[PDB]
Amino acid sequence: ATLPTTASSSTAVASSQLDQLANFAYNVTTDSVAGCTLQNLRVRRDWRAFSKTQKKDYINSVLCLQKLPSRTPAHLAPGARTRYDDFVATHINQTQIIHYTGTFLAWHRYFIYEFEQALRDECSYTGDYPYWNWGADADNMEKSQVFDGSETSMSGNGEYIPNQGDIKLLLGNYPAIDLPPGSGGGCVTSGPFKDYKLNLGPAALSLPGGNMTAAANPLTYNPRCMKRSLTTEILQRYNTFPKIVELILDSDDIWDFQMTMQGVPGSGSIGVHGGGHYSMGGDPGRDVYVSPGDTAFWLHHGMIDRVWWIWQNLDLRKRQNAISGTGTFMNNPASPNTTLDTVIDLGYANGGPIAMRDLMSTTAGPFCYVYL
Amino acid sequence: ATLPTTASSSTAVASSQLDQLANFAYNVTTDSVAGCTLQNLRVRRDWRAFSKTQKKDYINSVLCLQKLPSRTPAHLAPGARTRYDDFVATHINQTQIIHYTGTFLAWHRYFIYEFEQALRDECSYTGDYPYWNWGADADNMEKSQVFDGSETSMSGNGEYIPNQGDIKLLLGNYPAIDLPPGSGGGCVTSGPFKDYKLNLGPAALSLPGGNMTAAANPLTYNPRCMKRSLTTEILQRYNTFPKIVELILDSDDIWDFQMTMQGVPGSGSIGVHGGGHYSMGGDPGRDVYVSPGDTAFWLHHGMIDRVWWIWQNLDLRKRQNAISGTGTFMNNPASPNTTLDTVIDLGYANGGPIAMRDLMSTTAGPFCYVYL
Ligand SMILES: *[C@@H]1O[C@H](CO)[C@@H](O[C@@H]2O[C@H](CO)[C@@H](O[C@@H]3O[C@H](CO)[C@@H](O)[C@H](O)[C@@H]3O)[C@H](O)[C@H]2NC(C)=O)[C@H](O)[C@H]1NC(C)=O
Ligand SMILES: *[C@@H]1O[C@H](CO)[C@@H](O[C@@H]2O[C@H](CO)[C@@H](O[C@@H]3O[C@H](CO)[C@@H](O)[C@H](O)[C@@H]3O)[C@H](O)[C@H]2NC(C)=O)[C@H](O)[C@H]1NC(C)=O
Ligand SMILES: *[C@@H]1O[C@H](CO)[C@@H](O)[C@H](O)[C@H]1NC(C)=O
Ligand SMILES: *[C@@H]1O[C@H](CO)[C@@H](O)[C@H](O)[C@H]1NC(C)=O
Ligand SMILES: *[C@@H]1O[C@H](CO)[C@@H](O)[C@H](O)[C@H]1NC(C)=O
Ligand SMILES: *[C@@H]1O[C@H](CO)[C@@H](O)[C@H](O)[C@H]1NC(C)=O
Ligand SMILES: *[C@@H]1O[C@H](CO)[C@@H](O)[C@H](O)[C@H]1NC(C)=O
Ligand SMILES: *[C@@H]1O[C@H](CO)[C@@H](O)[C@H](O)[C@H]1NC(C)=O
Ligand SMILES: *[C@H]1O[C@H](CO)[C@@H](O)[C@H](O)[C@@H]1O
Ligand SMILES: *[C@H]1O[C@H](CO)[C@@H](O)[C@H](O)[C@@H]1O
Ligand SMILES: [Cu+2]
Ligand SMILES: [Cu+2]
Ligand SMILES: [Cu+2]
Ligand SMILES: [Cu+2]
Numbered sequence A, B: 001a002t003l004p005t006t007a008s009s010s011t012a013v014a015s016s017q018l019d020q021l022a023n024f025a026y027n028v029t030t031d032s033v034a035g036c037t038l039q040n041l042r043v044r045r046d047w048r049a050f051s052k053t054q055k056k057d058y059i060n061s062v063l064c065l066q067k068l069p070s071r072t073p074a075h076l077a078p079g080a081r082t083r084y085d086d087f088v089a090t091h092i093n094q095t096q097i098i099h100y101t102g103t104f105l106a107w108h109r110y111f112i113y114e115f116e117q118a119l120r121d122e123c124s125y126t127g128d129y130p131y132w133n134w135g136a137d138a139d140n141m142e143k144s145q146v147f148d149g150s151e152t153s154m155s156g157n158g159e160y161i162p163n164q165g166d167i168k169l170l171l172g173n174y175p176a177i178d179l180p181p182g183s184g185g186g187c188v189t190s191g192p193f194k195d196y197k198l199n200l201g202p203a204a205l206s207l208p209g210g211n212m213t214a215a216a217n218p219l220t221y222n223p224r225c226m227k228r229s230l231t232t233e234i235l236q237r238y239n240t241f242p243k244i245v246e247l248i249l250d251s252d253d254i255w256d257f258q259m260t261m262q263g264v265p266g267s268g269s270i271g272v273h274g275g276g277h278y279s280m281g282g283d284p285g286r287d288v289y290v291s292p293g294d295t296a297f298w299l300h301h302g303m304i305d306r307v308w309w310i311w312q313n314l315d316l317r318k319r320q321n322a323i324s325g326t327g328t329f330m331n332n333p334a335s336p337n338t339t340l341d342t343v344i345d346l347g348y349a350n351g352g353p354i355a356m357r358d359l360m361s362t363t364a365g366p367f368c369y370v371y372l
Helices: A011-032 A052-065 A083-097 A104-122 A232-238 A241-250 A254-262 A271-278 A297-313 B011-032 B052-065 B083-097 B104-122 B232-238 B241-250 B254-262 B271-278 B297-313
Strands: A042-046 A158-160 A167-169 A177-179 A185-188 A369-371 B042-046 B158-160 B167-169 B177-179 B185-188 B369-371
Touching (some): A011 A297, A011 A369, A052 A083, A104 A297, A167 A271, A232 A271, A241 A254, A254 A297, A271 A297, B011 B241, B011 B297, B011 B369, B083 B104, B104 B254, B167 B271, B232 B271, B254 B271, B254 B297
Antiparallel strands (some): B158 B185, B167 B177
């Protein structure tokens, strides 16, 4: 079998191209497994592949972390109430050193893995890690099994608010990127997270109209509802199967991969990573720091990690350990290059400090899983 | 009298142009003074204008802050030992929100004012705030009364180190700016600060050759000598009287002023602000975060504040309260615009929280001084 070399403009085959690439990556991962053996190798799976009661087992475990008390010392994050908040808080705390950095991909890989460990160790979860395949939902976000509002979604849309202005995304002094406000605006109307209390932020919440709300200290207590405004137009622009495959096949090195993924500034594109986030609309959906406060975050980054994993396995010799970038957001201010010895941590959320070299592979260090 | 409209290429008259502009600014400030009256109005003065024993009164007060114990809670900055360290620590702590921000100019104005208050309130200083006029020293940094190594300098050059590679200044992914390493390299050889213990950092120290050293936590204890490597070539490139006047006269709004001053990224220029800093070479001279750990910092920023003050007084109606920019370094990540209500503080160094509106004028809020 010879793999696709050029992304198709046809949605139907772009999807199949993606599946081929994934199959190859799956093949590479499995037979390289012949700590981590084929036996104890976990499989992360598309949300759609979960059955009703499996969906709910996951949801319930998450609701469990949203009920268990926070481990973060109150004086460090006064707003944190739950174990779940512990994760949100560390993400807020470290936002300026984990996006547009050399550590971005590996940090989020570790973040979601440790989230998973919390689910298993504290909330008795025994099911698989879920991911959200953007491409399948690119035409109707409201019908996504992740966002349909049912008892098996991560809740759905937010209360509709008429005539919201556009979202204006800034970075540096580049011209804004303009996005539609979606079909919601307010508190989520249904599903398992309808009564979920969002406790932290806003740190930097983009608002319809172009304004931004920012607490003096986004780690203080600010209990409020989760708001969404599902915006299908955004997925259509940045997260279609052709766009996904394009990112994989046109990215010749780790720099181009991660930059294309996140959206290079000034380019008018926010990539699959930005698209996934901003398509949720609402709050913290539109807050780069507080985004894990939206429960769909974990599924989104499941998919982010998948896409990275695929890209790596297309040329494992060159890509397995590939790193580019520094330890500061867009290298502002300048910091040293990230290396295999760079140490990251998730503060009080879970786990301990760990070096980049131990994160590069989904079947070494603490990791032992594959994506189906 | 009609003021210069175009910066002269002649060093001799560029200097006189500067003096005219300063005189005008002085005139505006005084007669606008007709809390702050002409009576209690302080005058900040060129270091050269200080007599021997006045120089030493200032130096001694600084050495006093370098001996009095730190107020910063040990658990917040384990490295801080002295009152002086309190200031360095807050600067390190806030570096990512006080450079390339809307607050940059006003924050540093408040920083040095509160430094001054520490000198007066804790170290019995009663003399004037000094500033370093770069232009007078642009041809021979070693002969500067600030850096001559005598008992009236801020110490002088560092131990000479042969064949140091160039300094390579990065920001974002723009091409590096290359600078010569100067005539020193090591510990300062003489003057009042020869035994001054530099306690904090490095946070991001640029090294000859292009490398950068960064502690895991630059607020922890790392006692070592202050190192300089006086680099006249740098002042010659960025800090000549023509360059100073150019910044004043060619900058039509606050954005262009502050950006030209700091060096716009990608432009190959580091402005009078970068030039002043990097011309000192050494450590923390080449560390954006830790720079106040070099005792010349206060004189440099005296001059920075002067240049701003002059520019403001050229059109006080439009410039007095002018602000542009956000609350994050180069607006990475994006944050709200700075406004007159934006509140800043210097943590434990001195003073309390204060709004931008109270900082805009050297003769309102807490301020009541002029530059001669
Ligand atoms: C947000 O990030 C900052 C910066 O990393 C975190 O501050 C860090 O806090 C921990 C302790 O709270 C420090 O760890 C060290 O622990 C050992 C004891 O095992 C002790 O010997 C050290 O002196 C230190 O306390 C870490 O150095 C410290 N870093 C800084 C710059 O203060 C903070 O915890 C994070 N906030 C949250 C809520 O996670
Ligand atoms: C570096 O900057 C951080 C962020 O500003 C500083 O953390 C801040 O620390 C102070 C107290 O240490 C917090 O002030 C508040 O004081 C009142 C009591 O008057 C209390 O009710 C509040 O809950 C809070 O403790 C401030 O909110 C806090 N901010 C964060 C994000 O933790 C830190 O102090 C700075 N480090 C140094 C050495 O200056
Ligand atoms: C994966 O390996 C299987 C089993 O040998 C093979 O049939 C299939 O063609 C491989 N997939 C790809 C995309 O190479
Ligand atoms: C956005 O901010 C401006 C300036 O503070 C304010 O006047 C306005 O009310 C805000 N606009 C919206 C859409 O709320
Ligand atoms: C931020 O200020 C700039 C001018 O410096 C202005 O163009 C922009 O509209 C402001 N942003 C908002 C949303 O207020
Ligand atoms: C400053 O005011 C004095 C006193 O009237 C005047 O002689 C001088 O010309 C003024 N300076 C400038 C530069 O306008
Ligand atoms: C700079 O860093 C490189 C890579 O770590 C190292 O090999 C080298 O020793 C350093 N160069 C200098 C000039 O010390
Ligand atoms: C940082 O890494 C880049 C490649 O991504 C390399 O070009 C540069 O030399 C590195 N910086 C240093 C000084 O090691
Ligand atoms: C296939 O459908 C996608 C949306 O899923 C479009 O983006 C593409 O142009 C093609 O029509
Ligand atoms: C006057 O002298 C300055 C240095 O002080 C030069 O930069 C300028 O070109 C002129 O020779
Ligand atoms: Cu993140
Ligand atoms: Cu993300
Ligand atoms: Cu500064
Ligand atoms: Cu400075």
